[PDB]
Amino acid sequence: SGFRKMAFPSGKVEGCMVQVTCGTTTLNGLWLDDVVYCPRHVICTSEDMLNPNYEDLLIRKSNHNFLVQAGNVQLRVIGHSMQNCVLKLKVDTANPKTPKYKFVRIQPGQTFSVLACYNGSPSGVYQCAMRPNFTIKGSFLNGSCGSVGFNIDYDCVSFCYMHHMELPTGVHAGTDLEGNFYGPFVDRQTAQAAGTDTTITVNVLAWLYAAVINGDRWFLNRFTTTLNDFNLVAMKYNYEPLTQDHVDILGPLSAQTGIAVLDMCASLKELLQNGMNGRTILGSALLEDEFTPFDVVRQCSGVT
Amino acid sequence: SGFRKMAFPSGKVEGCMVQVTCGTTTLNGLWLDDVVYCPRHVICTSEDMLNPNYEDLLIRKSNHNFLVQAGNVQLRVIGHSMQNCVLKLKVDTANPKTPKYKFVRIQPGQTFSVLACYNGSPSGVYQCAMRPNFTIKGSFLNGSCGSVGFNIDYDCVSFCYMHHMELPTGVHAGTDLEGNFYGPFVDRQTAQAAGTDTTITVNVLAWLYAAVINGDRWFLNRFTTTLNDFNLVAMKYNYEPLTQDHVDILGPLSAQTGIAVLDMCASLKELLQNGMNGRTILGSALLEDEFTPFDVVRQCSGVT
Ligand SMILES: *CC(=O)N1Cc2ccccc2C[C@H]1C(=O)NNC(C)=O
Ligand SMILES: *CC(=O)N1Cc2ccccc2C[C@H]1C(=O)NNC(C)=O
């Protein structure tokens, strides 16, 4: 028993981290097979970031201008190309530590682990969620750019995120591993306000099921609701509308606990309308939305 | 910017995890150099756990009764001994993945990362604290025993915890890597109530400094206090008494932010007396005590 915000074991990703330097700019790269992936803004100086023309900037760069260091060993760059907002540096050596991997573009509301790195060196790992507004609330200081987000299924690492920037509000924006930004963000030092950060309703319900499984049951009530009645409450509290797809993925948790999804919705409805009344659920005094139904099942069963 | 409950990169520990089986009991082992460390209750059946005589049970065991598997490869056990509550299985092969390491017995209030494992396979990593009552609030299911806690300083892993059991309250107890339990707990299936779980005051203050650094400043007030006045409040709210040693370790955070430690104590005092009033600090609606002053400095500076 016990429920924690758990990240995936980061070992498979640590072996892929490298340092990429171009001119006086240094950031993190991801070395998989004979390619190093990094944010294209490695070619920029601070002055260039105000309004960069990446195609024009990249013309003045050759393979020898990209310095790729894997710990203490230097990689020989034999090719370079830009794919959306990422640079792909072809190297002459395949990473011997390359795990089985995929590149995936995740949906908002999905969770993943971030291996925060500085100068190609891992500093920490944490679990977070792609917010419905396509930002992430991470922990990234200068030099962390190029750090990646991922999920792991037994031996396969699905890379889903590469950190590119911090909005003036302190929230984070980045791309998938094809270099396409999540959300409307551009890799330019210009104020880009993020949209409304709604709560991921299906995740809060999954976490409420995790709480019942682990003994925190005070919030269970004698009520039920309907999808449309619950969504009237969800809209008022800036929660994402719940759909039958969300109810379906909560099915295994509803079966294990014996609590119907709409009954759990009525508990959530009352929690939204009345608050916690000074109480806690799984060590939290607010409704947690960074655990997906898959994460709850995985943790509550011990999947390795 | 941003502040997250970050765990250390787990790679160095993943390479040490093995599966240890004795009879019909299977748990996790830690393979460092030519020794595998695991909880001594691997020699017990469920029936033995009610009142085990480990010395008498271990007499009926030989080296060939301990099955040690590192992924898919089997290790040859050439020696076995009991040191307090851990078994040390000498194997004929040194772990090629053994990182630089130390064994440390941590103090209550200190934090560490746990690599939750099942059958020798890592499932997740999370950061937690050794509570003042010598329990940890982890996430451990059946088969997770032998999972370890650690800290990392650049290339050196300091192992500090090995999971042994769950109290009937759902909190967790374990040993240092010399097999000595933290707290008064014994490795026996008998009700062992834990003492009062107090809040780690120095950690809450460190987290309040992390919040100010990251822009959450609403809780700063126009007041100050004294160590004795603050401790009257700390005692009423089951917070650990603050000492000049605690003030001293908060010195770098007080210097960086310009907020005197006693002024931050007066903010904490008002938060204890008035609550959060429906507000949040670093995404939390309660006062977080699982970040040490060292963790806050490390994260707020980017130590790898
Ligand atoms: C790596 C990083 O932190 N960056 C890269 C980048 C990309 C796009 C626009 C601006 C920058 C600069 C920097 C930041 O995101 N830093 N803070 C800002 C611009 O708010
Ligand atoms: C590994 C494990 O979960 N254990 C080992 C152990 C050690 C000491 C006493 C009892 C047991 C059984 C088991 C538990 O801790 N499980 N739950 C209990 C006993 O509450």
The DSSP code sequence of A91-102 is ESS--TTPPEEE
Structure tokens at A189: 């030092």
Q: Under an 8 A CB cutoff, do B122 and A303 touch? A: no
**Pick from B3, B11, B275: which is nearest to A139 by CB?**
B3
CA distance B268 to B208: 8
Contact check, Cβ <8 Å, B126/A7: yes
Handedness of CA A249, A254, A255, A257 (dihedral sign): positive
Q: Say how many Å lie between the CA of residue B2 and the centre of ligand 1.
A: 14
- Chain A: give the shortest CA distance to residue B3, in Å: 5
Q: Is B188 in the pocket of ligand 2 (CB under 6 A)?
A: yes
The position carrying tokens 């203050």 is B205
Domain edge (last residue) among A47, A74, A99: A99
**Closest by CA position to A124, among listed B215, B300, B129:** B300
Cα B237 from Cα B272, distance rounded (Å): 7
Yes or no, beta carbons of B304 and A6 under 8 Å apart: no
Whether residues A161 and A105 fall in one domain: yes
Residues A291 and A218 in one domain: yes
Do the Cβ atoms of B103 and B120 come closer than 8 Å? no
Asked if A122's CB is within 8 angstroms of B6's CB, the reply is no
According to DSSP, the β-strands at B172-175 and B156-166 are antiparallel
CA nearest B137 in A: which residue? A2
> Could you tell me which chain B residue has the CA closest to the CA of A8?
B124
Range of the domain at B161: 1-14+100-197
Task: Please tell me whether residues B205 and B290 are part of one structural domain.
Answer: yes
Integer Cα distance of B70 and B83 in angstroms: 22
Query: Cα(A158)–Cα(A174) distance, rounded to whole angstroms?
Result: 16
What is the 3-state secondary structure of chain B?
CCCCCCECCCHHHHCCEEEEEECCEEEEEEEECCEEEEEHHHHCCCCHHHCCCHHHHHHCCCHHHEEEEECCEEECEEEEEEECCEEEEEECCCCCCCCEEEECCCCCCCEEEEEEEECCEEEEEEEEECCCCCCECCCCCCCCCCCEEEEEECCEEEEEEEEEEECCCCCEEEECCCCCECCCCCCCCCCCCCCCCCECHHHHHHHHHHHHHCCCCCCCCCCCCCHHHHHHHHHHCCECCCCHHHHHHCHHHHHHHCCCHHHHHHHHHHHHHHCCCCCCECCECCCCCCCCHHHHHHHHHCCC
C-alpha A41 chain-centroid distance: 20
Q: Are residues A272 and A295 in the same domain?
A: yes
Q: Based on the domain organization, do B94 and B109 belong to the same domain?
A: no
Of the candidates B152, B147, B156, which has an alpha carbon nearest to the alpha carbon of residue B177?
A: B147
Whether A289 lines ligand 1, by a CB cut-off of 6 Å, is no
CA B208 – CA B287 distance, rounded (Å): 9
Phi then psi for residue B296, to 5 deg, are -65, -45
Helix or strand holding residue A158 (H, E) = strand A156-166
Residue type, B18: V
Please check whether residue B276 is in contact with residue B285, taking contact to mean a CB–CB distance below 8 angstroms.
Answer: yes
Task: Fill in the amino acid letter for B115.
Answer: L
How far off is chain B from A110, nearest CA to CA, in Å? 17
Query: DSSP 3-state assignment of A272?
Result: helix
- Say if ligand 1 is within 6 A of residue A41 CB: yes
Task: Determine the straight-line distance between the first and last CA of chain B, rounded to whole angstroms.
Answer: 16
Tell me the ligand closest to A188's alpha carbon. 1
Residue B106 one-letter amino acid: I
Residues from chain A contacting residue B280 (CB–CB below 8 Å): 286
Which of B82, B99, B116 is at the close of a domain? Answer: B99
With a 6 A CB cut-off, is A162 part of the ligand 1 pocket?
Answer: no
Angle at which helix A261-274 crosses helix A227-236, to 10 degrees, equals 30
Query: Token pair for residue B206?
Result: 């460190």
> Residue B192: which CATH number?
2.40.10.10
Q: Which amino acid is at A23?
A: G
Residues B186 and B220 in one domain: no
Provide the CATH number for the domain around residue A268: 1.10.1840.10
Q: Tell me how far the alpha carbon of residue A165 lies from the centroid of ligand 1, in angstroms.
A: 4
Q: Which residues contact A188 (CB under 8 A, 6 or more apart)?
A: A49, A50, A51, A52
Count of CA atoms in the C-beta half-sphere (13 A) of A242? 29
User: Is B170 touching ligand 2 by the criterion CB < 6 Å?
Assistant: no
User: Do residues B163 and B144 touch, judged by C-beta distance below 8 A?
Assistant: yes
CA A20 to ligand 1 center in whole angstroms: 16
Would you name the residues of A annotated as active-site residues? 41, 145
- Ligand 2 lined by B295 (C-beta under 6 Å): no
Please give the tally of structural domains in chain A.
Answer: 3
- Measured CA to CA, the distance from residue A35 to residue A38 in angstroms comes to 10
Residues A141 and A193 in one domain: yes
Domain endpoint, select from B141, B165, B197 = B197
Radius of gyration of chain B (CA): 21
What dihedral angle (degrees, nearest 10) is formed by the CA atoms of A191, A192, A198, A199?
Answer: -80
**Interface residue A4 vs chain B (CB under 8 A):** yes
Q: Does residue A204's CB lie within 6 angstroms of at least one atom of ligand 1?
A: no
The answer to whether the CB of A145 is under 6 A from ligand 1 is yes
Q: Would you call A115 and B301 a contact, using CB atoms and an 8 Å cutoff? A: no
Which amino acid appears at position B42 of this protein?
V
A5: which 2 tokens? 């915000």
Expressed in angstroms and rounded, the spacing between residue B75 Cα and the centre of ligand 2 is: 26
First to last CA, chain A: 16
Indicate whether A213 and A276 sit together in one domain. yes
Q: What is the DSSP letter of A254?
A: H
Looking at residue A130, its amino acid is M
Residues 91-130, chain A: which have Cβ within 8 Å of B? 115-119, 121-126, 128
Burial track A109-136 (b if 16+ CB lie within 10 A, e otherwise): bbbbbbbbbbbbbbbbbbbbbbbbbbbb
CA-CA distance, A200 to A133, in Å (whole number)? 11
Q: What DSSP element (H or E) covers A149?
A: strand A148-153
- Of A24, A34, A238, A165, the C-alpha closest to B1 is A165
The values of phi and psi at residue A244, to 5°, are -65, -25
The rounded Å distance from CA A189 to ligand 1 centre is: 6
Two structure tokens written together for A126: 């944490």
Asked if residue A25 and residue A164 are part of one domain, the reply reads no
Which ligand 1 atom is at minimum distance from the Cα of A146?
A: 1
Tell me how far apart the alpha carbons of residues B180 and B184 are, in angstroms, rounded to a whole number.
10
Q: Are residues B178 and B112 in the same domain?
A: yes
| Six token digits for residue A229 | 């009645």
Q: Distance from A5 to chain B by nearest Cα, in Å? A: 7
Q: For residue A168, list chain B residues with Cβ-Cβ distance below 8 A.
A: none
- Write phi, then psi, for A17 (nearest 5 degrees): -80, 130
CB-based contact A58:A85 (threshold 8 Å): no
Residues 6+ apart with CB under 8 A from B29: B17, B18, B19, B20, B36, B37, B38, B68, B89, B120, B146
Check if the beta carbon of residue B261 is closer than 8 Å to that of residue B247.
yes
Residues of B annotated as catalytic (active site), given as ranges: 41, 145
Radius of gyration from C-alpha coordinates of chain A: 21
Sign of CA dihedral A262, A264, A267, A272: negative
A174 with A110, same domain? Answer: yes
From the CB of residue A280, how many other CB atoms can be counted at a distance below 10 Å?
14
| Chain A interface includes B77 (CB < 8 A) | no
| Cα nearest neighbour of B11 on chain A | A11
Elucidation method? X-ray
**What single-letter DSSP state applies at residue A147?**
-
Asked if residue B10 and residue B109 are part of one domain, the reply reads: yes
DSSP character at residue A106: P
Resolution to one decimal, Å: 1.6
List residues bridging with B87 in a β-sheet. Answer: B38, B82
Mutual angle of helices B201-213 and B293-301, in 10-degree steps: 20
Q: Is A46 on the interface with B (CB under 8 A)?
A: no
Contact A9 B143 (CB under 8 A): no
